[PDB]
Amino acid sequence: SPIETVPVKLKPGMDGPKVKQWPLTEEKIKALVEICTEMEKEGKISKIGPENPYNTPVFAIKWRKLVDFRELNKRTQDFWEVQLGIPHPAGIKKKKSVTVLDVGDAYFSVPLDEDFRKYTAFTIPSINNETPGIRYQYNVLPQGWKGSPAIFQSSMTKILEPFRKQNPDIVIYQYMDDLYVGSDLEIGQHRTKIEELRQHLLRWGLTTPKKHQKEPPFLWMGYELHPDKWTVQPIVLPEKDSWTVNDIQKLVGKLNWASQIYPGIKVRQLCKLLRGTKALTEVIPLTEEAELELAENREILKEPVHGVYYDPSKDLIAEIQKQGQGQWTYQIYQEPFKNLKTGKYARMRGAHTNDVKQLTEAVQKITTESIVIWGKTPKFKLPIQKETWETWWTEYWQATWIPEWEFVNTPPLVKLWYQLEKEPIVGAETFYVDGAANRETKLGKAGYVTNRGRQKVVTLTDTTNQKTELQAIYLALQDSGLEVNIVTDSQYALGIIQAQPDQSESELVNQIIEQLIKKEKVYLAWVPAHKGIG
Amino acid sequence: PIETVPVKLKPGMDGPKVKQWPLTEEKIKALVEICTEMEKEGKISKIGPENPYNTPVFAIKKKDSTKWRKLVDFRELNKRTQDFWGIPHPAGIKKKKSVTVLDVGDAYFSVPLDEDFRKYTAFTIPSINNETPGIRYQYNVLPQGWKGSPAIFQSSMTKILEPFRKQNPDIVIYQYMDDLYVGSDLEIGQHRTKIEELRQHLLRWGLTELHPDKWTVQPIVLPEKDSWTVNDIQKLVGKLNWASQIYPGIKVRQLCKLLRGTKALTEVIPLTEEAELELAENREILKEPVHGVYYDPSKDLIAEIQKQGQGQWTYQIYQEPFKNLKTGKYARMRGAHTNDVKQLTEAVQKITTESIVIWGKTPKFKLPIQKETWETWWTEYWQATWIPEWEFVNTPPLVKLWYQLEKEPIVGAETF
Numbered sequence: 001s002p003i004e005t006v007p008v009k010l011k012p013g014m015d016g017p018k019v020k021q022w023p024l025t026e027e028k029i030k031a032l033v034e035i036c037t038e039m040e041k042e043g044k045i046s047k048i049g050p051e052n053p054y055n056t057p058v059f060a061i062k063w064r065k066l067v068d069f070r071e072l073n074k075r076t077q078d079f080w081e082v083q084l085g086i087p088h089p090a091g092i093k094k095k096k097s098v099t100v101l102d103v104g105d106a107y108f109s110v111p112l113d114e115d116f117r118k119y120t121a122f123t124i125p126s127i128n129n130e131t132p133g134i135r136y137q138y139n140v141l142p143q144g145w146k147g148s149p150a151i152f153q154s155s156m157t158k159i160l161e162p163f164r165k166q167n168p169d170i171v172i173y174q175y176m177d178d179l180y181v182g183s184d185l186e187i188g189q190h191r192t193k194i195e196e197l198r199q200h201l202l203r204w205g206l207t208t209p210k211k212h213q214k215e216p217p218f219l220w221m222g223y224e225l226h227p228d229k230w231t232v233q234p235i236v237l238p239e240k241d242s243w244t245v246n247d248i249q250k251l252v253g254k255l256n257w258a259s260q261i262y263p264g265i266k267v268r269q270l271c272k273l274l275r276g277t278k279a280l281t282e283v284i285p286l287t288e289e290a291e292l293e294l295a296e297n298r299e300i301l302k303e304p305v306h307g308v309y310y311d312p313s314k315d316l317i318a319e320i321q322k323q324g325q326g327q328w329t330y331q332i333y334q335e336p337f338k339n340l341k342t343g344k345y346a347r348m349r350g351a352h353t354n355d356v357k358q359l360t361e362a363v364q365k366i367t368t369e370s371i372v373i374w375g376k377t378p379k380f381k382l383p384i385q386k387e388t389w390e391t392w393w394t395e396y397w398q399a400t401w402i403p404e405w406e407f408v409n410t411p412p413l414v415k416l417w418y419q420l421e422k423e424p425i426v427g428a429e430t431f432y433v434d435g436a437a438n439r440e441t442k443l444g445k446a447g448y449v450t451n452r453g454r455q456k457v458v459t460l461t462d463t464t465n466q467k468t469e470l471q472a473i474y475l476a477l478q479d480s481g482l483e484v485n486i487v488t489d490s491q492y493a494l495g496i497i498q499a500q501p502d503q504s505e506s507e508l509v510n511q512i513i514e515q516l517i518k519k520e521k522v523y524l525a526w527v528p529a530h531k532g533i534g
Numbered sequence: 535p536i537e538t539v540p541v542k543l544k545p546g547m548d549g550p551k552v553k554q555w556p557l558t559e560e561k562i563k564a565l566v567e568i569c570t571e572m573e574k575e576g577k578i579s580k581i582g583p584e585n586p587y588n589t590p591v592f593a594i595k596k597k598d599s600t601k602w603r604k605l606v607d608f609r610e611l612n613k614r615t616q617d618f619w620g621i622p623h624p625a626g627i628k629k630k631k632s633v634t635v636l637d638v639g640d641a642y643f644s645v646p647l648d649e650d651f652r653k654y655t656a657f658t659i660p661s662i663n664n665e666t667p668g669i670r671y672q673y674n675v676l677p678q679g680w681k682g683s684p685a686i687f688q689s690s691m692t693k694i695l696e697p698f699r700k701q702n703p704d705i706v707i708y709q710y711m712d713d714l715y716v717g718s719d720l721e722i723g724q725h726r727t728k729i730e731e732l733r734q735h736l737l738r739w740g741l742t743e744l745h746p747d748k749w750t751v752q753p754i755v756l757p758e759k760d761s762w763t764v765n766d767i768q769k770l771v772g773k774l775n776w777a778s779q780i781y782p783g784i785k786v787r788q789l790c791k792l793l794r795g796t797k798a799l800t801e802v803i804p805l806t807e808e809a810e811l812e813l814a815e816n817r818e819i820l821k822e823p824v825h826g827v828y829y830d831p832s833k834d835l836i837a838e839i840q841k842q843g844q845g846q847w848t849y850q851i852y853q854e855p856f857k858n859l860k861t862g863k864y865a866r867m868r869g870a871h872t873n874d875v876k877q878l879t880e881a882v883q884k885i886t887t888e889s890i891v892i893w894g895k896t897p898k899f900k901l902p903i904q905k906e907t908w909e910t911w912w913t914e915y916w917q918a919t920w921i922p923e924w925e926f927v928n929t930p931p932l933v934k935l936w937y938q939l940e941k942e943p944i945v946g947a948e949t950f
């Protein structure tokens with residue numbers, strides 16, 4: 001072609017590949033000898049001679065051909081990332097017409113930096129490793145070579161510039177060997193322009209085909225794309241009578257992907273089947289509950305989920321629900337009930353945190369996503385009162401934020417499970433708690449003594465020092481009335497005061513939190529340990 | 535329109551390969567414009583895929599403009615770029631009544647960049663939803679935000695300034711990145727007017743309110759109370775005890791003897807004469823910054839920030855723990871009430887400029903924010919040509935409680 005080549009080079013100080021030509025039968029050689037005389041005439045390759053010390057093994061599977069560039073590739077320089085981030089159905093706009101042009105064969109239509117070609121040398125074996133084999137090399141981007149994807153696209157980009165300029169109201173998406181061309185022109189004008197494009201391309205040697213011709217809807221990321229809207233490619237759950245772990249994991253994976261689009265999907269009981277499995281091929285019988293939810297899911301999945309595309313002229317709204325502790329669901333739409341996208345985030349589990357914090361996190365993940373999809377952030381409708389937000393955030397130790405949002409009374413609402421008092425409680429009993437353990441024998445004591453004369457101690461075995469300290473706080477909570485002042489020298493209690501977590505990785509802390517939540521007033525105070533403090 | 539100087543990366547260093555972070559539509563539209571223009575003006579050229587480097591780029595709205603400015607994050611490239619051993623720090627700059635900052639980044643485009651170094655300036659304009667490939671460019675001229683620009687352009691900058699410097703030798707001019715910090719004691723009126731005089735001058739080539747003498751270092755003020763309760767003393771003792779890591783003469787022995795017994799948290803305690811004096815000696819120690827603290831040009835400058843709440847923030851600049859070079863409080867700027875990120879951002883910029891004015895270098899920040907929160911939004915409120923380094927931390931409860939104690943004005947900074 002008359003396309004300028006891209007200057008390619010080998011990684012820092014490496015030399016081209018020298019892997020020996022795998023041995024083949026006469027049937028396989030006569031076939032490759034065939035295919036290569038073809039490519040050779042199509043200008044795709046060039047018979048070279050002894051002036052080449054490089055080589056790549058050529059194979060023959062059906063009689064087609066396959067060149068293994070694993071070696072050349074590992075020696076080839078790196079190119080700037082070839083579009084790895086693809087479009088999401090929720091972000092594209094509806095089109096009157098969309099046509100996909102298979103410019104696949106164009107892979108072998110783009111010239112290869114003449115200087116680099118020598119490295120693509122390969123050998124068609126001899127009938128019996130007797131006489132010298134047939135030597136060749138590529139003049140174009142080799143199928144399976146590292147720089148082909150990047151170079152093919154950049155080349156496609158240059159070529160498409162003029163056309164793109166001349167036809168602003170026409171969108172062309174380049175992906176792999178395809179060109180999805182969309183537009184809002186009358187179908188005849190569209191068809192006309194596709195032909196103009198097809199020709200323009202033809203001008204650069206890029207020939208595109210009615211038979212292979214692809215038509216809408218299109219399969220993309222698990223959606224079926226129609227010009228006016230999208231649908232989810234129906235997902236089928238293999239009804240079986242013998243489930244191995246592989247079957248069960250794969251299943252859970254697909255169900256996991258479905259929870260994004262379909263409401264009510266559940267895998268809790270199916271995941272239970274994975275416990276203590278001794279091998280992938282191990283057959284695990286489905287419990288009753290597993291047989292059950294796997295049944296409801298088959299149903300939920302029979303429901304047709306359809307969607308809509310992005311209309312720039314309308315608002316972008318994002319609604320969030322708290323389907324359980326740490327679990328969040330959301331749907332983004334412009335017009336009520338016509339979603340662009342939906343999804344949910346894996347149960348957020350951490351060392352220690354709170355629901356309002358988690359919320360802001362779900363909010364930032366959506367925002368990061370939205371900026372990518374629409375280059376704008378959705379207006380949020382959150383299940384939390386503006387007061388709850390103002391109270392929490394304005395005082396939290398960590399910087400946090402939520403873009404423009406509005407409250408929506410869709411229970412369950414996210415709230416503050418408790419709030420430590422800001423000042424000691426007059427008239428409330430004051431527990432002076434303390435815990436201590438031998439870090440090596442794991443033996444400890446936990447207890448308290450109050451200004452009111454109440455006291456208690458407990459001996460613990462196989463415990464840690466932090467646990468005794470917390471258990472001391474726990475007992476105080478357990479044994480006090482609705483209002484209590486608790487003083488401790490526990491450094492961990494210092495974190496609890498600052499962060500006021502409503503969820504933790506520590507079961508003990510969680511037990512403490514359940515107590516905190518239950519009290520009407522709790523003042524937690526910290527003092528340094530080993531002082532004149534009694 | 536001159537010859538170019540051979541620049542290289544530090545030995546063993548390869549070019550940046552930083553991913554472009556996602557941009558809003560507005561931001562992308564502005565860059566496309568700004569970039570086709572510079573392309574036409576020959577300042578940048580589209581590049582191939584054979585160039586593997588990349589640097590994040592984005593757009594800001596500098597003070598007073600609806601026009602977007604292209605801002606590139608050359609932090610990575612800067613660190614990789616060789617050294618030029620710029621100008622030493624004019625210690626005097628930090629002692630001026632008034633200091634004004636000027637953006638002279640536009641002077642660099644008038645200078646060609648070594649062709650051999652261009653590959654490394656590769657940047658990419660993303661596309662919404664990835665429907666269009668990214669628009670790859672690289673620079674042909676000195677870029678704003680790259681440490682090499684103010685360096686190479688030093689000789690030309692000094693020349694163009696001498697006249698003003700001599701006409702006004704009582705004025706100090708220090709350049710940092712794309713910035714120029716002009717400091718003088720002239721009254722605000724004769725100052726700002728003297729600035730434009732400099733502008734006009736600086737202007738005839740192609741170029742277009744700080745008070746260092748008021749960045750006083752503040753003392754910790756321990757509470758004084760008519761009557762003290764068990765809790766008051768405890769809160770107190772805990773802070774003082776922490777504080778003893780800075781001032782070893784601070785003691786809570788006598789006070790902790792009052793915390794003997796299991797009395798109610800709200801019960802009043804009589805302060806023994808020993809306790810009384812103990813507090814007095816402590817208040818005296820805290821009457822001044824700890825001795826022996828000197829800045830070290832060979833050390834990294836650190837800037838820690840704590841969120842105090844209600845739009846309040848505290849920071850400390852040090853190189854070694856508990857040996858602050860400076861500390862202070864920061865109140866949110868009007869129109870930022872509901873935005874933690876905007877407030878923090880504004881603070882980072884304020885502290886960095888101070889750090890620049892004082893030591894002529896930026897501090898590495900310890901920020902009380904989650905990485906994602908910051909990365910998602912800091913750019914929306916950024917206005918400086920430079921970008922400091924940062925790390926995300928968890929604020930220790932005590933550090934916040936201690937600096938919460940700093941002294942504030944009797945009334946404030948009064949002016950009708």
Ligand SMILES: CC(C)=CCOc1cc(NC(=S)c2ccoc2C)ccc1Cl
Nearest residue numbers: 092093095171173180181182225226227
């Ligand atoms: C992601 C993908 C393969 C899209 C092509 O299919 C469609 C694309 C659009 N609308 C847009 S904005 C368009 C047209 C060509 O390329 C794009 C990205 C609408 C419907 C379908 Cl069926």
